[PDB]
Design a protein around this nucleic acid. Structure first.
Ligand SMILES: [Mg+2]
Length: 577
DNA sequence: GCGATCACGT
DNA sequence: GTACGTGATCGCA
Protein backbone atom coordinates (compact mmCIF):
# COMPACT_ATOMS: atom_id res chain seq x y z
CA UNK A 1 0.00 0.00 0.00
CA UNK A 2 0.87 3.68 -0.19
CA UNK A 3 -0.25 7.16 0.80
CA UNK A 4 -2.45 8.84 -1.78
CA UNK A 5 -1.55 12.26 -0.45
CA UNK A 6 -3.48 15.50 -0.76
CA UNK A 7 -0.63 17.75 0.42
CA UNK A 8 3.16 17.57 0.69
CA UNK A 9 4.56 16.58 4.07
CA UNK A 10 8.07 16.77 5.49
CA UNK A 11 8.62 13.02 5.49
CA UNK A 12 8.11 13.08 1.73
CA UNK A 13 11.19 15.34 1.48
CA UNK A 14 14.01 13.16 2.81
CA UNK A 15 17.51 13.37 1.37
CA UNK A 16 17.31 10.10 -0.60
CA UNK A 17 14.27 8.97 -2.55
CA UNK A 18 13.17 7.21 -5.66
CA UNK A 19 11.16 9.81 -7.59
CA UNK A 20 8.69 9.36 -10.46
CA UNK A 21 7.58 12.48 -12.37
CA UNK A 22 5.41 10.93 -15.04
CA UNK A 23 5.10 12.32 -18.55
CA UNK A 24 3.00 10.01 -20.67
CA UNK A 25 3.17 11.96 -23.94
CA UNK A 26 6.04 10.55 -25.99
CA UNK A 27 7.36 13.99 -26.90
CA UNK A 28 7.85 15.47 -23.44
CA UNK A 29 8.43 19.12 -24.51
CA UNK A 30 5.83 21.35 -22.79
CA UNK A 31 3.87 18.16 -22.05
CA UNK A 32 1.65 17.39 -19.04
CA UNK A 33 3.00 15.81 -15.88
CA UNK A 34 0.24 13.37 -14.96
CA UNK A 35 1.30 12.38 -11.46
CA UNK A 36 4.16 11.98 -9.05
CA UNK A 37 5.35 9.21 -6.76
CA UNK A 38 7.98 9.32 -4.02
CA UNK A 39 9.42 6.33 -2.18
CA UNK A 40 11.89 6.85 0.65
CA UNK A 41 12.75 5.50 4.09
CA UNK A 42 9.45 6.81 5.52
CA UNK A 43 7.00 5.27 3.07
CA UNK A 44 5.45 5.46 -0.38
CA UNK A 45 3.57 8.50 -1.62
CA UNK A 46 1.49 9.53 -4.61
CA UNK A 47 1.16 13.27 -5.22
CA UNK A 48 -1.11 14.97 -7.69
CA UNK A 49 1.04 17.28 -9.83
CA UNK A 50 -1.18 20.37 -9.74
CA UNK A 51 -0.74 20.20 -5.96
CA UNK A 52 2.91 19.22 -5.52
CA UNK A 53 4.35 21.46 -8.25
CA UNK A 54 2.77 24.51 -6.61
CA UNK A 55 4.18 23.60 -3.18
CA UNK A 56 7.26 25.70 -2.32
CA UNK A 57 8.68 22.98 -0.09
CA UNK A 58 8.26 20.37 -2.80
CA UNK A 59 9.75 22.68 -5.47
CA UNK A 60 12.72 23.55 -3.24
CA UNK A 61 13.30 19.85 -2.57
CA UNK A 62 13.23 19.04 -6.30
CA UNK A 63 15.82 21.75 -6.92
CA UNK A 64 18.06 20.86 -3.98
CA UNK A 65 21.18 19.07 -5.24
CA UNK A 66 21.78 17.69 -1.74
CA UNK A 67 18.46 15.81 -1.78
CA UNK A 68 19.34 12.74 -3.80
CA UNK A 69 16.92 11.13 -6.22
CA UNK A 70 16.86 7.81 -8.03
CA UNK A 71 14.81 7.87 -11.21
CA UNK A 72 14.21 6.25 -14.60
CA UNK A 73 14.88 8.55 -17.59
CA UNK A 74 15.38 11.67 -15.49
CA UNK A 75 15.95 13.83 -18.60
CA UNK A 76 12.29 13.42 -19.53
CA UNK A 77 11.18 14.72 -16.13
CA UNK A 78 13.89 17.39 -16.07
CA UNK A 79 12.73 18.82 -19.40
CA UNK A 80 9.01 18.70 -18.65
CA UNK A 81 9.81 20.56 -15.42
CA UNK A 82 12.00 23.10 -17.25
CA UNK A 83 8.96 23.99 -19.38
CA UNK A 84 7.15 24.63 -16.10
CA UNK A 85 9.99 26.77 -14.81
CA UNK A 86 11.16 24.24 -12.20
CA UNK A 87 14.68 22.94 -11.70
CA UNK A 88 15.36 19.26 -11.00
CA UNK A 89 18.65 18.63 -9.23
CA UNK A 90 20.26 15.89 -7.22
CA UNK A 91 19.52 12.95 -9.54
CA UNK A 92 22.18 10.50 -8.33
CA UNK A 93 21.02 7.34 -10.15
CA UNK A 94 19.17 6.94 -13.44
CA UNK A 95 17.99 3.36 -13.93
CA UNK A 96 17.51 3.80 -17.69
CA UNK A 97 21.14 4.82 -18.14
CA UNK A 98 22.29 2.08 -15.75
CA UNK A 99 20.45 -0.63 -17.71
CA UNK A 100 21.67 0.82 -21.02
CA UNK A 101 25.30 0.63 -19.90
CA UNK A 102 24.87 -2.93 -18.57
CA UNK A 103 23.61 -4.29 -21.87
CA UNK A 104 22.42 -1.93 -24.61
CA UNK A 105 20.92 -4.81 -26.61
CA UNK A 106 18.13 -5.38 -24.07
CA UNK A 107 16.21 -2.40 -25.43
CA UNK A 108 15.19 -1.35 -21.90
CA UNK A 109 12.42 1.14 -22.57
CA UNK A 110 10.67 1.10 -19.22
CA UNK A 111 11.08 0.37 -15.54
CA UNK A 112 9.51 -3.07 -15.98
CA UNK A 113 12.05 -4.12 -18.62
CA UNK A 114 14.94 -3.04 -16.39
CA UNK A 115 13.38 -4.67 -13.33
CA UNK A 116 13.10 -7.99 -15.16
CA UNK A 117 16.91 -7.98 -15.53
CA UNK A 118 17.14 -8.60 -11.77
CA UNK A 119 14.09 -10.89 -11.40
CA UNK A 120 11.88 -8.03 -10.15
CA UNK A 121 8.41 -8.29 -11.69
CA UNK A 122 6.10 -6.39 -9.28
CA UNK A 123 5.62 -3.58 -11.81
CA UNK A 124 3.78 -3.47 -15.11
CA UNK A 125 5.16 -2.34 -18.48
CA UNK A 126 4.12 1.22 -19.36
CA UNK A 127 2.44 -0.11 -22.51
CA UNK A 128 0.18 -2.34 -20.41
CA UNK A 129 -1.01 0.63 -18.31
CA UNK A 130 -1.36 3.35 -20.95
CA UNK A 131 -2.07 1.24 -24.03
CA UNK A 132 -0.48 1.86 -27.40
CA UNK A 133 -1.46 3.72 -30.53
CA UNK A 134 -5.00 4.94 -31.00
CA UNK A 135 -6.01 3.52 -27.60
CA UNK A 136 -3.31 5.31 -25.61
CA UNK A 137 -4.71 7.09 -22.57
CA UNK A 138 -3.94 8.09 -19.01
CA UNK A 139 -5.96 5.82 -16.69
CA UNK A 140 -8.00 6.88 -13.68
CA UNK A 141 -6.07 7.93 -10.59
CA UNK A 142 -6.29 4.60 -8.66
CA UNK A 143 -4.75 2.74 -11.59
CA UNK A 144 -2.28 5.54 -12.27
CA UNK A 145 -1.17 5.94 -8.65
CA UNK A 146 -0.51 2.23 -8.17
CA UNK A 147 1.60 2.14 -11.35
CA UNK A 148 3.66 5.22 -10.48
CA UNK A 149 4.17 3.93 -6.94
CA UNK A 150 5.23 0.46 -8.18
CA UNK A 151 7.71 2.09 -10.55
CA UNK A 152 9.25 4.13 -7.72
CA UNK A 153 9.34 1.07 -5.47
CA UNK A 154 11.06 -0.92 -8.20
CA UNK A 155 13.61 1.91 -8.68
CA UNK A 156 14.22 2.01 -4.91
CA UNK A 157 14.78 -1.76 -4.87
CA UNK A 158 16.93 -1.94 -8.02
CA UNK A 159 19.57 0.78 -7.41
CA UNK A 160 21.84 -1.44 -5.30
CA UNK A 161 21.90 -4.48 -7.68
CA UNK A 162 22.38 -2.33 -10.78
CA UNK A 163 25.17 -0.30 -9.16
CA UNK A 164 26.76 -3.54 -7.93
CA UNK A 165 26.96 -5.04 -11.43
CA UNK A 166 28.12 -1.72 -12.90
CA UNK A 167 30.97 -1.77 -10.38
CA UNK A 168 31.86 -5.35 -11.27
CA UNK A 169 31.95 -4.21 -14.92
CA UNK A 170 34.08 -1.14 -14.02
CA UNK A 171 31.23 0.96 -15.41
CA UNK A 172 30.31 2.79 -12.19
CA UNK A 173 32.23 5.90 -13.19
CA UNK A 174 30.92 5.67 -16.75
CA UNK A 175 27.42 6.09 -15.33
CA UNK A 176 28.16 8.63 -12.60
CA UNK A 177 30.81 10.78 -14.31
CA UNK A 178 29.77 10.54 -17.98
CA UNK A 179 26.20 9.47 -18.83
CA UNK A 180 24.41 11.08 -15.89
CA UNK A 181 26.17 14.49 -16.19
CA UNK A 182 25.66 14.28 -19.96
CA UNK A 183 21.94 13.57 -19.40
CA UNK A 184 21.57 17.01 -17.78
CA UNK A 185 23.52 18.77 -20.51
CA UNK A 186 21.27 17.20 -23.13
CA UNK A 187 18.23 18.35 -21.15
CA UNK A 188 19.44 21.96 -21.40
CA UNK A 189 20.24 21.58 -25.10
CA UNK A 190 16.79 20.17 -25.87
CA UNK A 191 15.06 22.87 -23.82
CA UNK A 192 17.06 25.71 -25.39
CA UNK A 193 16.14 24.48 -28.85
CA UNK A 194 17.44 25.81 -32.16
CA UNK A 195 15.85 28.75 -33.95
CA UNK A 196 14.52 27.97 -37.45
CA UNK A 197 14.11 30.51 -40.27
CA UNK A 198 10.74 29.16 -41.34
CA UNK A 199 10.34 31.74 -44.09
CA UNK A 200 13.59 30.48 -45.62
CA UNK A 201 12.33 26.90 -45.22
CA UNK A 202 9.03 27.69 -46.93
CA UNK A 203 11.03 29.37 -49.70
CA UNK A 204 13.07 26.21 -50.29
CA UNK A 205 9.89 24.14 -50.31
CA UNK A 206 8.41 26.47 -52.88
CA UNK A 207 11.55 26.16 -54.93
CA UNK A 208 11.40 22.36 -54.76
CA UNK A 209 7.68 22.18 -55.58
CA UNK A 210 8.25 24.10 -58.82
CA UNK A 211 11.22 21.89 -59.70
CA UNK A 212 9.18 18.77 -58.98
CA UNK A 213 6.44 19.91 -61.16
CA UNK A 214 8.88 20.43 -63.96
CA UNK A 215 10.58 17.04 -63.69
CA UNK A 216 7.30 15.23 -63.04
CA UNK A 217 5.72 16.69 -66.19
CA UNK A 218 8.82 15.51 -68.06
CA UNK A 219 8.52 11.98 -66.66
CA UNK A 220 4.88 11.65 -67.74
CA UNK A 221 5.97 13.00 -71.13
CA UNK A 222 8.61 10.31 -71.59
CA UNK A 223 6.52 7.58 -69.96
CA UNK A 224 3.75 8.47 -72.42
CA UNK A 225 1.46 8.08 -69.41
CA UNK A 226 0.62 9.52 -66.01
CA UNK A 227 1.25 7.51 -62.86
CA UNK A 228 2.34 7.86 -59.24
CA UNK A 229 6.11 8.13 -59.62
CA UNK A 230 6.34 7.86 -55.81
CA UNK A 231 4.90 4.34 -55.99
CA UNK A 232 7.74 1.84 -56.61
CA UNK A 233 5.10 -0.62 -57.88
CA UNK A 234 3.55 1.66 -60.51
CA UNK A 235 7.04 2.79 -61.48
CA UNK A 236 8.23 -0.80 -61.87
CA UNK A 237 5.23 -1.35 -64.15
CA UNK A 238 6.35 1.52 -66.37
CA UNK A 239 10.13 1.06 -66.49
CA UNK A 240 10.26 -2.68 -66.96
CA UNK A 241 7.39 -4.31 -68.81
CA UNK A 242 6.14 -1.09 -70.46
CA UNK A 243 9.42 0.51 -71.55
CA UNK A 244 11.12 -2.93 -71.65
CA UNK A 245 14.13 -1.92 -69.59
CA UNK A 246 16.22 -4.78 -68.27
CA UNK A 247 15.49 -6.25 -64.87
CA UNK A 248 18.93 -6.22 -63.27
CA UNK A 249 17.78 -6.70 -59.65
CA UNK A 250 14.64 -8.09 -58.01
CA UNK A 251 12.79 -7.18 -54.80
CA UNK A 252 11.25 -9.87 -52.60
CA UNK A 253 7.89 -9.37 -54.36
CA UNK A 254 8.57 -7.49 -57.60
CA UNK A 255 10.81 -5.10 -59.52
CA UNK A 256 13.61 -3.29 -57.71
CA UNK A 257 13.83 0.46 -58.36
CA UNK A 258 16.72 1.44 -56.07
CA UNK A 259 18.95 4.37 -56.99
CA UNK A 260 21.91 2.00 -57.33
CA UNK A 261 19.93 0.04 -59.93
CA UNK A 262 18.50 3.08 -61.72
CA UNK A 263 21.88 4.69 -62.47
CA UNK A 264 22.86 1.55 -64.41
CA UNK A 265 19.58 1.82 -66.37
CA UNK A 266 20.11 5.48 -67.30
CA UNK A 267 21.90 4.89 -70.68
CA UNK A 268 18.77 3.16 -71.99
CA UNK A 269 16.07 5.81 -71.55
CA UNK A 270 15.89 9.53 -70.69
CA UNK A 271 13.19 8.82 -68.08
CA UNK A 272 15.73 7.30 -65.70
CA UNK A 273 17.73 10.47 -65.00
CA UNK A 274 14.45 12.30 -64.38
CA UNK A 275 13.25 9.54 -62.04
CA UNK A 276 16.56 9.98 -60.24
CA UNK A 277 16.05 13.75 -60.04
CA UNK A 278 12.44 13.36 -58.85
CA UNK A 279 13.57 11.14 -55.98
CA UNK A 280 16.35 13.54 -54.96
CA UNK A 281 14.13 16.60 -54.71
CA UNK A 282 11.21 14.49 -53.49
CA UNK A 283 13.03 13.34 -50.37
CA UNK A 284 14.35 16.82 -49.59
CA UNK A 285 10.85 18.27 -49.96
CA UNK A 286 8.78 15.58 -48.29
CA UNK A 287 11.17 14.34 -45.60
CA UNK A 288 13.30 17.35 -44.68
CA UNK A 289 11.52 20.59 -45.64
CA UNK A 290 7.99 19.49 -44.78
CA UNK A 291 9.33 17.26 -42.00
CA UNK A 292 11.15 20.16 -40.34
CA UNK A 293 8.27 22.61 -40.70
CA UNK A 294 6.00 20.14 -38.85
CA UNK A 295 8.16 20.06 -35.68
CA UNK A 296 8.88 23.80 -35.36
CA UNK A 297 7.12 25.22 -32.32
CA UNK A 298 5.16 28.25 -33.55
CA UNK A 299 5.34 29.89 -30.12
CA UNK A 300 9.11 30.26 -30.34
CA UNK A 301 10.05 29.32 -33.93
CA UNK A 302 12.48 26.71 -32.58
CA UNK A 303 12.84 22.98 -32.97
CA UNK A 304 13.36 21.13 -29.70
CA UNK A 305 14.90 17.75 -30.48
CA UNK A 306 14.80 14.76 -28.15
CA UNK A 307 18.10 12.93 -27.72
CA UNK A 308 17.77 9.21 -27.13
CA UNK A 309 20.73 8.60 -24.86
CA UNK A 310 19.97 4.90 -24.32
CA UNK A 311 19.37 3.48 -27.79
CA UNK A 312 22.41 2.75 -29.98
CA UNK A 313 24.56 -0.30 -29.39
CA UNK A 314 27.72 1.77 -29.94
CA UNK A 315 27.02 4.45 -27.33
CA UNK A 316 26.46 7.12 -29.98
CA UNK A 317 23.69 9.59 -29.29
CA UNK A 318 20.61 9.58 -31.47
CA UNK A 319 17.92 12.26 -31.80
CA UNK A 320 14.32 12.62 -33.00
CA UNK A 321 11.59 15.14 -33.80
CA UNK A 322 13.59 16.34 -35.62
CA UNK A 323 16.44 13.94 -36.29
CA UNK A 324 18.95 16.58 -37.34
CA UNK A 325 21.67 13.95 -37.81
CA UNK A 326 19.76 12.54 -40.80
CA UNK A 327 19.94 15.82 -42.78
CA UNK A 328 22.17 15.10 -45.81
CA UNK A 329 25.86 16.02 -45.60
CA UNK A 330 26.27 16.06 -49.38
CA UNK A 331 24.24 17.75 -52.10
CA UNK A 332 24.24 21.47 -52.79
CA UNK A 333 20.65 21.46 -51.57
CA UNK A 334 20.76 18.77 -48.88
CA UNK A 335 23.39 20.42 -46.71
CA UNK A 336 21.90 23.81 -47.63
CA UNK A 337 18.82 23.04 -45.55
CA UNK A 338 21.16 23.94 -42.67
CA UNK A 339 20.74 27.58 -43.76
CA UNK A 340 17.42 27.38 -41.91
CA UNK A 341 19.10 26.93 -38.52
CA UNK A 342 19.96 30.38 -37.21
CA UNK A 343 20.97 31.97 -33.88
CA UNK A 344 18.09 32.47 -31.48
CA UNK A 345 19.02 36.09 -30.62
CA UNK A 346 20.18 39.13 -32.55
CA UNK A 347 23.96 39.64 -32.84
CA UNK A 348 24.55 35.99 -31.97
CA UNK A 349 26.23 33.55 -34.33
CA UNK A 350 26.50 29.81 -34.86
CA UNK A 351 29.80 28.17 -33.85
CA UNK A 352 30.38 24.63 -35.17
CA UNK A 353 33.37 22.41 -34.40
CA UNK A 354 33.91 18.86 -35.56
CA UNK A 355 36.44 16.09 -35.04
CA UNK A 356 38.53 15.35 -38.11
CA UNK A 357 38.74 11.58 -38.68
CA UNK A 358 38.26 10.74 -35.02
CA UNK A 359 37.30 7.12 -35.78
CA UNK A 360 40.47 6.36 -37.77
CA UNK A 361 42.49 8.21 -35.13
CA UNK A 362 40.87 6.06 -32.44
CA UNK A 363 41.68 2.99 -34.57
CA UNK A 364 45.32 4.14 -34.86
CA UNK A 365 45.50 4.38 -31.07
CA UNK A 366 43.74 1.12 -30.19
CA UNK A 367 45.54 -0.94 -32.82
CA UNK A 368 48.89 0.83 -32.29
CA UNK A 369 49.48 0.45 -36.00
CA UNK A 370 52.82 2.16 -36.64
CA UNK A 371 52.01 3.38 -40.15
CA UNK A 372 48.56 4.72 -39.24
CA UNK A 373 49.87 6.48 -36.13
CA UNK A 374 52.71 8.08 -38.09
CA UNK A 375 50.25 9.21 -40.76
CA UNK A 376 48.24 11.11 -38.16
CA UNK A 377 51.29 12.40 -36.26
CA UNK A 378 52.36 13.87 -39.64
CA UNK A 379 48.75 15.11 -40.09
CA UNK A 380 48.60 13.56 -43.57
CA UNK A 381 45.59 13.36 -45.82
CA UNK A 382 44.59 9.91 -44.65
CA UNK A 383 42.85 8.89 -47.87
CA UNK A 384 45.77 10.09 -49.97
CA UNK A 385 48.26 8.27 -47.73
CA UNK A 386 46.15 5.10 -47.78
CA UNK A 387 46.11 5.24 -51.60
CA UNK A 388 49.89 5.74 -51.70
CA UNK A 389 50.39 2.60 -49.61
CA UNK A 390 47.79 0.36 -51.24
CA UNK A 391 48.94 1.22 -54.76
CA UNK A 392 52.65 1.66 -53.89
CA UNK A 393 52.80 5.05 -55.60
CA UNK A 394 54.14 8.48 -54.77
CA UNK A 395 51.78 11.27 -53.71
CA UNK A 396 51.85 12.90 -57.17
CA UNK A 397 50.96 9.52 -58.71
CA UNK A 398 47.66 9.29 -56.78
CA UNK A 399 44.82 9.80 -59.25
CA UNK A 400 41.35 10.89 -58.12
CA UNK A 401 39.94 7.39 -58.62
CA UNK A 402 42.74 5.91 -56.51
CA UNK A 403 41.91 8.29 -53.68
CA UNK A 404 38.20 7.46 -54.05
CA UNK A 405 38.94 3.75 -53.69
CA UNK A 406 41.20 4.22 -50.65
CA UNK A 407 38.58 6.49 -49.08
CA UNK A 408 35.98 3.75 -49.64
CA UNK A 409 38.23 1.23 -47.86
CA UNK A 410 38.63 3.67 -44.97
CA UNK A 411 34.87 4.31 -44.94
CA UNK A 412 34.34 0.57 -44.71
CA UNK A 413 36.42 0.41 -41.54
CA UNK A 414 34.77 3.41 -39.88
CA UNK A 415 31.26 2.00 -40.42
CA UNK A 416 32.02 -1.74 -40.37
CA UNK A 417 31.18 -2.61 -44.01
CA UNK A 418 31.59 -6.15 -45.35
CA UNK A 419 33.71 -6.88 -48.41
CA UNK A 420 30.45 -7.35 -50.33
CA UNK A 421 29.35 -3.87 -49.26
CA UNK A 422 32.77 -2.58 -50.24
CA UNK A 423 32.36 -4.35 -53.58
CA UNK A 424 28.85 -2.92 -53.79
CA UNK A 425 30.31 0.47 -52.84
CA UNK A 426 33.05 0.43 -55.47
CA UNK A 427 30.99 -1.31 -58.17
CA UNK A 428 33.62 -4.06 -58.28
CA UNK A 429 33.54 -7.79 -57.71
CA UNK A 430 33.83 -9.35 -54.27
CA UNK A 431 37.13 -10.93 -55.34
CA UNK A 432 38.55 -7.52 -56.27
CA UNK A 433 37.13 -5.96 -53.10
CA UNK A 434 38.78 -8.75 -51.08
CA UNK A 435 42.20 -8.18 -52.69
CA UNK A 436 41.83 -4.47 -51.94
CA UNK A 437 41.31 -5.35 -48.28
CA UNK A 438 44.35 -7.62 -48.29
CA UNK A 439 46.55 -4.86 -49.72
CA UNK A 440 45.27 -2.56 -46.97
CA UNK A 441 46.34 -5.07 -44.33
CA UNK A 442 49.78 -5.34 -45.94
CA UNK A 443 50.26 -1.61 -45.37
CA UNK A 444 48.53 -1.55 -41.96
CA UNK A 445 49.48 -4.85 -40.32
CA UNK A 446 48.67 -3.45 -36.88
CA UNK A 447 45.08 -2.85 -37.99
CA UNK A 448 44.91 -6.47 -39.18
CA UNK A 449 46.25 -7.73 -35.84
CA UNK A 450 43.69 -5.60 -34.03
CA UNK A 451 40.91 -6.99 -36.22
CA UNK A 452 41.95 -10.60 -35.55
CA UNK A 453 42.58 -9.95 -31.86
CA UNK A 454 39.26 -8.22 -31.18
CA UNK A 455 37.25 -10.99 -32.81
CA UNK A 456 39.10 -13.50 -30.65
CA UNK A 457 38.55 -11.42 -27.51
CA UNK A 458 34.85 -11.14 -28.32
CA UNK A 459 34.67 -14.92 -28.64
CA UNK A 460 36.54 -15.42 -25.37
CA UNK A 461 34.86 -12.87 -23.09
CA UNK A 462 31.45 -12.60 -24.82
CA UNK A 463 31.71 -8.84 -25.38
CA UNK A 464 33.92 -5.99 -26.52
CA UNK A 465 34.49 -2.65 -24.80
CA UNK A 466 35.30 0.96 -25.59
CA UNK A 467 37.93 3.29 -24.17
CA UNK A 468 35.68 4.38 -21.29
CA UNK A 469 34.44 0.79 -20.64
CA UNK A 470 31.15 0.73 -22.54
CA UNK A 471 30.38 -2.84 -23.60
CA UNK A 472 28.55 -4.67 -26.35
CA UNK A 473 27.72 -8.37 -25.98
CA UNK A 474 28.03 -10.41 -29.18
CA UNK A 475 26.34 -13.79 -28.75
CA UNK A 476 26.13 -14.18 -32.55
CA UNK A 477 29.94 -14.35 -32.77
CA UNK A 478 29.47 -18.12 -32.28
CA UNK A 479 26.85 -18.60 -35.00
CA UNK A 480 27.16 -21.26 -37.67
CA UNK A 481 25.20 -18.96 -40.01
CA UNK A 482 27.90 -17.21 -42.04
CA UNK A 483 26.13 -13.87 -42.47
CA UNK A 484 25.07 -13.75 -38.82
CA UNK A 485 28.59 -14.49 -37.58
CA UNK A 486 30.17 -12.08 -40.08
CA UNK A 487 28.01 -9.22 -38.81
CA UNK A 488 28.96 -10.01 -35.20
CA UNK A 489 32.60 -10.04 -36.28
CA UNK A 490 32.25 -6.62 -37.87
CA UNK A 491 30.52 -5.34 -34.75
CA UNK A 492 33.38 -6.78 -32.69
CA UNK A 493 35.71 -4.74 -34.92
CA UNK A 494 33.65 -1.55 -35.25
CA UNK A 495 32.21 -0.96 -31.80
CA UNK A 496 35.50 -0.20 -29.97
CA UNK A 497 36.13 2.36 -32.73
CA UNK A 498 32.74 4.04 -33.08
CA UNK A 499 31.96 3.61 -29.38
CA UNK A 500 35.26 5.05 -28.19
CA UNK A 501 34.63 7.99 -30.52
CA UNK A 502 31.22 8.32 -28.86
CA UNK A 503 32.94 8.26 -25.46
CA UNK A 504 35.32 11.05 -26.44
CA UNK A 505 32.61 13.32 -27.85
CA UNK A 506 30.46 12.87 -24.72
CA UNK A 507 33.42 13.70 -22.47
CA UNK A 508 34.17 16.70 -24.69
CA UNK A 509 30.59 17.93 -24.24
CA UNK A 510 30.88 17.64 -20.46
CA UNK A 511 34.32 19.30 -20.43
CA UNK A 512 33.09 22.11 -22.70
CA UNK A 513 29.97 22.83 -20.66
CA UNK A 514 32.13 23.13 -17.54
CA UNK A 515 34.66 25.41 -19.25
CA UNK A 516 31.94 27.67 -20.65
CA UNK A 517 30.55 28.24 -17.15
CA UNK A 518 34.04 28.61 -15.64
CA UNK A 519 34.69 31.28 -18.27
CA UNK A 520 31.28 32.94 -17.69
CA UNK A 521 30.52 32.83 -21.41
CA UNK A 522 26.95 33.17 -22.67
CA UNK A 523 27.75 30.60 -25.36
CA UNK A 524 25.64 27.49 -25.28
CA UNK A 525 25.71 23.98 -26.75
CA UNK A 526 22.75 23.41 -29.08
CA UNK A 527 23.32 20.14 -30.99
CA UNK A 528 25.61 17.15 -31.22
CA UNK A 529 25.39 15.23 -34.48
CA UNK A 530 27.87 13.01 -36.34
CA UNK A 531 31.29 14.10 -34.95
CA UNK A 532 30.27 17.76 -34.66
CA UNK A 533 29.31 20.05 -31.78
CA UNK A 534 27.17 23.09 -32.67
CA UNK A 535 26.88 26.15 -30.42
CA UNK A 536 25.45 29.64 -30.56
CA UNK A 537 26.99 32.64 -28.81
CA UNK A 538 27.16 36.44 -28.90
CA UNK A 539 29.30 37.57 -31.80
CA UNK A 540 31.52 39.20 -29.15
CA UNK A 541 32.44 35.65 -27.96
CA UNK A 542 33.61 34.16 -31.28
CA UNK A 543 37.32 34.97 -30.89
CA UNK A 544 37.39 33.39 -27.43
CA UNK A 545 35.50 30.35 -28.73
CA UNK A 546 37.95 29.98 -31.61
CA UNK A 547 40.58 29.16 -28.99
CA UNK A 548 38.46 27.54 -26.29
CA UNK A 549 36.27 25.01 -28.11
CA UNK A 550 38.97 23.20 -30.17
CA UNK A 551 41.28 23.08 -27.14
CA UNK A 552 38.67 21.47 -24.90
CA UNK A 553 37.71 19.02 -27.66
CA UNK A 554 41.33 18.16 -28.50
CA UNK A 555 42.16 17.54 -24.83
CA UNK A 556 39.05 15.51 -23.93
CA UNK A 557 41.25 12.39 -23.85
CA UNK A 558 44.92 11.75 -24.58
CA UNK A 559 45.58 9.20 -27.33
CA UNK A 560 48.73 7.96 -29.05
CA UNK A 561 47.77 10.29 -31.92
CA UNK A 562 46.52 13.87 -31.71
CA UNK A 563 42.86 14.69 -31.90
CA UNK A 564 42.15 17.25 -34.62
CA UNK A 565 39.24 19.70 -34.64
CA UNK A 566 37.93 21.87 -37.47
CA UNK A 567 35.88 24.88 -36.44
CA UNK A 568 33.98 27.65 -38.20
CA UNK A 569 31.30 30.17 -37.35
CA UNK A 570 28.72 32.06 -39.35
CA UNK A 571 25.23 33.45 -39.50
CA UNK A 572 23.58 30.02 -40.05
CA UNK A 573 24.51 26.41 -39.41
CA UNK A 574 25.33 26.07 -43.11
CA UNK A 575 27.50 29.18 -43.05
CA UNK A 576 29.49 27.89 -40.06
CA UNK A 577 31.72 26.18 -42.62
C1' DG B 1 -2.12 -0.06 -37.78
C1' DC B 2 1.64 -3.49 -40.30
C1' DG B 3 5.13 -4.96 -44.02
C1' DA B 4 7.54 -3.45 -47.74
C1' DT B 5 10.50 -0.24 -50.49
C1' DC B 6 13.50 3.54 -50.68
C1' DA B 7 17.05 6.88 -48.97
C1' DC B 8 19.25 9.05 -45.33
C1' DG B 9 22.40 8.44 -41.61
C1' DT B 10 25.19 4.70 -38.63
C1' DG C 1 20.96 -14.48 -48.79
C1' DT C 2 25.12 -10.34 -48.42
C1' DA C 3 24.12 -3.47 -42.90
C1' DC C 4 21.30 -1.98 -38.98
C1' DG C 5 18.73 2.54 -37.26
C1' DT C 6 15.60 6.61 -38.72
C1' DG C 7 11.33 8.40 -41.23
C1' DA C 8 8.11 8.97 -45.44
C1' DT C 9 5.11 6.72 -48.87
C1' DC C 10 2.43 3.36 -50.47
C1' DG C 11 0.63 -0.90 -50.31
C1' DC C 12 -2.66 -4.61 -47.97
C1' DA C 13 -5.77 -6.99 -43.99
MG1 LIG D 1 29.73 10.50 -37.19
Amino acid sequence: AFTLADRVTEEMLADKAALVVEVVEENYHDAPIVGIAVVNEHGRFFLRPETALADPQFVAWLGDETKKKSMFDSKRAAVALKWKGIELCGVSFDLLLAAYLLDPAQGVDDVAAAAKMKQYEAVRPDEAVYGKGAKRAVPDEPVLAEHLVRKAAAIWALERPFLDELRRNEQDRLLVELEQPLSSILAEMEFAGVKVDTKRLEQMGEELAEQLRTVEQRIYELAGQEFNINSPKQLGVILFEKLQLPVLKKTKTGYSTSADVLEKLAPYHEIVENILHYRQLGKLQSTYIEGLLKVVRPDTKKVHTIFNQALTQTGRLSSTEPNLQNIPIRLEEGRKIRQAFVPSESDWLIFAADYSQIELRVLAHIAEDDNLMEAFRRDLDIHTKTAMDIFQVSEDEVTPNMRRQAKAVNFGIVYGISDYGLAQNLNISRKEAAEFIERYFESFPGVKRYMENIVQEAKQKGYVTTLLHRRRYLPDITSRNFNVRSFAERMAMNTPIQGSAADIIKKAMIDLNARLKEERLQARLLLQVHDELILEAPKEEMERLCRLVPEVMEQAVTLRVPLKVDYHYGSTWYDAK
